[PDB]
Assembly symmetry: D2
Homo-oligomer: 390 residues x 4
């Protein structure tokens, strides 16, 4: 089996309670679904299944993947499901879809992720009844997204642990963050994100608004402004809101089919999926996940690390990002060339399809042959995928 | 590629706010994961991944499937993820596991489902705030489990749609339900759930309790107690509390590996998976999903309906189940031989694994060579899987 | 001016989530208003104002006093208002009614209090929105009723403060508590609450229930059952659920007019109000409020402590009740002759009026000439009223 | 007894979720208490009681009036209590305060009201429990403040009832409303609210903000702006957001003592309370309440309507204000000379004190000898107070 990405698309990443503050994930989803269909010239009638990574579905109704697909125009006869491996989710969905094709179960799959961290509700278990006493309304975004289920503290605390292990100074984390911002503002301005982004129309009462730019990138980001910030978790620590990514909203998708199918339709694919791997690590240092993941995927692809021409490695925190780069030893000048999530944002279930978008379109534009996408995963996991240009 | 269910276990299904009223899904999940390992004689450290269907994860912490796997002693090295195709989630998880092993990405998978409908919280989106006026706190079990996203109404209203299209009377669904209650009562007393069920220890403060029996089945179920119930959804309707399944809690799972590996380990498998399928249908008549999904599966196995020795066809509603039997035309004496969900319970994300567990242990008990398991899915889909004993 | 109490009534006192669990305070209020009118031979058309103490009006609608008055058939031309001096409220309401008559602003007032602790809601401020992080749903009963606003701790902690300053042992508190129960039981069995109580009909769907007995009084209370309880507020503390009053529902009221008006009508009044007083104390030892208030009220009446024939002093906690008795030195045999709040219950806003009811019917029964009613108030206050028989 | 108002003060009236959006009512209250004291040259140690009207206390903690008094430095020996007769509260507190002094129960009282509509929580009764389905989180400001308890509709509907009975056109209402804005604007710019307002410091993390000006008054209000609005309550109705008052925060108070005590201390009082009255009306036309109350107060004073030099009549709705003016026949040019609540706001429990404040400082400024303050009250009441200058 030879499976290709025929097309891909993503929304802009919206800031917490910004452009997409009242926009449900399945609407962002539906827009990306329509985009990948139109970009490859495949009708929505020909899609067999839609697979979407989503971490925070509380309150959005039955199977939001099926809602995304129906709104996109996919017919009732196809199928649609969601899945959750946290930040890994959106890239893992892409691997799952490839498997559907490889085992002769489907011809054409749309896979990716969607998230609205904005729209995540607060909740409380209330059936028994609260006879006496205050009770907590729990923020589901914090509880289901950002808190370790075993140790009970924030993901940023695991970033703290990774920093300590690898002895990464505050100045090393800030300098990395300022580079990711500077790279991102540069790509934005030079038009390097227009290709991958499909504009979203936010319908309203007193006017439609078109959103086509990443609103979380901060312009003119400087080391001095990074150095002014207070530590955000450990009170004499090194992780801040400046060297960690944010809470964001968006969606992203790819259309997969067999190489042969693409050639029958005259489609020029963005890449062939050569290998993928998922691996587990200690949850206290979950940011190490991408290391055994990226190395296992490379092993499956039969490739050496120096064979890679481009990498996209999710930047949840500057700490885990510096460490991952240090261990694997690949050339920093080929990693996150258009910036990473510290700058662009981290819409969790979507992020893995997001970075895959960035990779595929950058690989197309510089003529790169081989690349890899990798992310760390809360609870101690990593996921990775190798991509080769045709 | 030939993939087999080495082993399988489920919990008793508990009634709503009943035995597992304060038990999170991942604990019921950890208990079945450990039982599949034990029953097979496989060490937890040999498990590559745990895949669990779960529909209602709100408030349960990051990646509940990872929480289940970790409490069951599966090492940190392994991976876990959750997925949602509503009531088909648990069956689909098994197929996804199968796929992991057939694409050469894994050796040993634990797959199934888990659900606590009792532990599901109420929620509201409150980030923008509520400037003025009343607002609703939403039941996430109804909103995310039992309400159609497209038309707005309860799943029982779809069952009513199918009762009118297939012209099924209230005496025909009442007859169906009592028969299911009688079949499930006779099975329980006969000892025929003992093998599949693993006891679960409810940890309390004033005493542990060991749950090893389904508590939702009602004994001595009469047609008159059925015929004295007012309709739940349509006031001139046929669907009532008694001819529809309940709200339940439980978990259900299966250990997957290749046939060659089952033989190297000296494991005699419960069955070989031969084909599966999912298909979509008109959401208004979602209960019909199992018709095309069973047909596609049966065709992907090269089988005729006639070949089948045993079928488990989830009874969400008597209306949908009466209708599926009518269209397919298999012998109703080989369907849900030990009762159905009307009797037993319908723990949504878990139900598809549940009915697989009953199918496998019954097929072994009687000596049946071929089995089909199938379920309808909210939003309008079906899933099915063909099993063959060795 | 001389103001009399022409008539008085109270409902039975309901247990927390017991007989009155779903009855709003204003329906209790209305039954008592009707009763005081009937008992005096005064028509509702003659009432000028209704004044009701009430601590916990949240969720009850606009001005519950007006709702109570209107339901009892008091004409729209009358006025009605609520007030809050915490447990002082129902007694203060009577002094405020007496003031409207003394200043010539009204002729006939109904005053007292009403409280539904069971029907108190939980609440949160949600207008600004909750951008990120958990929030508490606050129990309004605990927050508005039972928590000190200055120090942040439960009223039971101020009882601990008093026990420590007055060196009152757990043994002494428990004996006081068991004596309260035993006196209240005896009084109930002997019929001594019959006169003061007006029966309340709790309307239902499957039948009405009449409630005319205090349900919180525990029959056969033992010293062993007080002695086994654990401290409720301080782990080396002495105050327990046994030697504190409970959380309760009820209403109580009195009909006030000038002495000259009672004589024109041919009414035999229950008592003349001779004096009242309210004084502040340190919040930390609020249970001491009755000391300065009783002494002030006695000064104003021109009476010595030894002149009193009967005293009702509210027993919020055994600790403060004991301290009050010690400081004042009145003969304990004339205090709370029929038990107090430890046994009967403490429906906050109604209690001041409840104990006045008990005092007036007992004075009448035994022919006592001079009486005092007093209560402590959260936030550090005391209220007292001197009554003389005619 | 002759009782005088020695001094008075109010905060600026804040807009809904505006300047006081996170300021509890008791904080606003404490500032006004300190101000009346400072203005009269009376020490906090001399105050016997504080009486504060307040409609919406839910969530604020035990007895907010005590909390306000304590914050202002009134000694623990003094007493404090809240009351609620709706928009009547803040004026009625003054009359209650006058009564304490007239019956010789106190010498120095601070009386007024406070309200934070912004801080009013949402609530639900959750004790019994919510077994299944959605439930309502009720806005306490609307339920307890603005909804009639007998008919279930907004106060705005009662305004429509009045407009209908009195045949008041939309253009007459919109003219009154624009006049009220234009008079308030003029008075604000001329500095006529300076004397009555005490500045409130809103303590902020990143800077304090001093609030000394009424923020709800619209500058340059046009008739065309009123004329374009949609009816707010009845779809062919006449009452709009423009010709109704708003939802607002504020506090207001007066220091009261005997005329002879003022003389001893050398205080030139703002006024002598000559009479007061409260009367009920039909709830359906509650806006007519000022008519019978103002006539009763004038009767009790021995004054004809034409003896009055200045009137303050609260403007809940233009409709009722117009009705009141037409029935009473007072010269409209002496009524609400500096604008009314349509322009300044309506902080419910504080409103009656706010209008008293305005009346006293205007009477002083122009040398008017005879004044009257009156307001309508939800549930069908009126309150009125007559003042004479010394
Ligand atoms: C495997 C995984 O994927 S784990 C990853 C999952 N995602 C996460 O864990 C998210 C991690 N981040 C978070 O949880 C949150 O965004 C936090 C806690 C770090 C920050 O949240 P907040 O406390 O609300 O920080 P916020 O975004 O407001 O920033 C704080 C201040 O720093 C400023 N700031 C941040 N970055 C910069 C910068 N580069 N330059 C200058 N100023 C900056 C902001 O403007 C802000 O100022 P303000 O509050 O006066 O307006
Ligand atoms: C794709 C899919 O899978 S769609 C399927 C998804 N599943 C569902 O939608 C679940 C459908 N069922 C439901 O929603 C609910 O069970 C309902 C609304 C139908 C009824 O449940 P509830 O409203 O919570 O009521 P409850 O479970 O307490 O039972 C109601 C009454 O019927 C009685 N009852 C129900 N069945 C029977 C029976 N077979 N014999 C005798 N009595 C019965 C109960 O004992 C109870 O009686 P009571 O009022 O005298 O105490
Ligand atoms: C000025 C003023 O007014 S301040 C006063 C205001 N009012 C108050 O502060 C009320 C004080 N009391 C309270 O707040 C509460 O009732 C508390 C916290 C003390 C106890 O509340 P709860 O959690 O409902 O405890 P609860 O009433 O169920 O009692 C606990 C146990 O003690 C037992 N108990 C209580 N009294 C007795 C007794 N006399 N004999 C035997 N057992 C007893 C109960 O039966 C119960 O037993 P269980 O746990 O085995 O079932
Ligand atoms: C006896 C008694 O005391 S009963 C009195 C008790 N109080 C009440 O009953 C309160 C009555 N008022 C209310 O309930 C509310 O203020 C309402 C329902 C009338 C309006 O409230 P809201 O829903 O928040 O509407 P809002 O105040 O935003 O006004 C709506 C629009 O009209 C506009 N508007 C308001 N006043 C004016 C004006 N004078 N000129 C021009 N436009 C105006 C606003 O700017 C707003 O425009 P926008 O939303 O595009 O920015």
């Amino acid at each position: 089996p030879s499976i290709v990405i025929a097309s891909a698309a993503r929304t802009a990443v919206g800031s917490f309670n910004g452009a997409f503050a009242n926009t449900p994930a399945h609407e962002l989803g539906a827009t990306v679904i329509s985009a990948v269909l139109e970009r490859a010239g495949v009708a929505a009638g020909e899609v067999n299944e839609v697979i979407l990574g989503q971490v925070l579905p509380a309150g959005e109704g039955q199977n939001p993947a099926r809602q995304a697909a129906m709104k996109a125009g996919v017919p009732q006869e196809a199928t649609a499901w969601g899945m959750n491996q946290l930040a890994g989710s959106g890239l893992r969905a892409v691997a799952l879809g490839m498997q559907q094709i490889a085992t002769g179960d489907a011809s054409i799959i749309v896979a990716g992720g969607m998230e609205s961290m904005s729209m995540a509700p607060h909740c409380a278990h209330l059936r028994g009844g609260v006879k006496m006493g205050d009770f907590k309304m729990i923020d589901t975004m914090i509880k289901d997204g950002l808190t370790d289920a075993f140790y009970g503290y924030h993901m940023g605390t695991t970033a703290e642990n990774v920093a300590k292990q690898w002895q990464l100074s505050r100045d090393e984390q800030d300098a990395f963050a300022v580079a990711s911002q500077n790279k991102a503002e540069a790509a934005q301005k030079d038009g390097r994100f227009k290709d991958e982004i499909v504009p979203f129309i936010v319908k309203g009462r007193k006017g439609d608004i078109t959103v086509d730019a990443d609103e979380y990138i901060r312009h003119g980001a400087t080391l001095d402004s990074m150095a002014k910030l207070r530590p955000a978790f450990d009170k004499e620590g090194t992780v801040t809101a400046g060297n960690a990514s944010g809470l964001n909203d968006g969606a992203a998708a790819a259309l997969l089919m067999s190489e042969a199918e693409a050639s029958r339709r005259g489609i020029q694919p963005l890449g062939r999926i050569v290998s993928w791997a998922t691996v587990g690590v200690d949850p206290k240092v979950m940011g190490t996940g991408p290391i055994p993941a990226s190395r296992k995927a490379l092993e499956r692809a039969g490739w050496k690390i120096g064979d890679l021409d481009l990498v996209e490695a999710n930047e949840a925190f500057a700490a885990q990002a510096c460490a991952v780069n240090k261990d694997l030893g690949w050339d920093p000048s080929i990693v996150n060339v258009n910036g990473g999530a510290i700058a662009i944002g981290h819409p969790i279930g979507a992020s893995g399809a997001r970075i895959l978008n960035t990779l595929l379109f950058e690989m197309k534009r510089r003529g790169a042959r081989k690349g890899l996408a990798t992310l760390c995963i809360g609870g101690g996991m990593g996921v990775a995928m190798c991509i080769e240009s045709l």
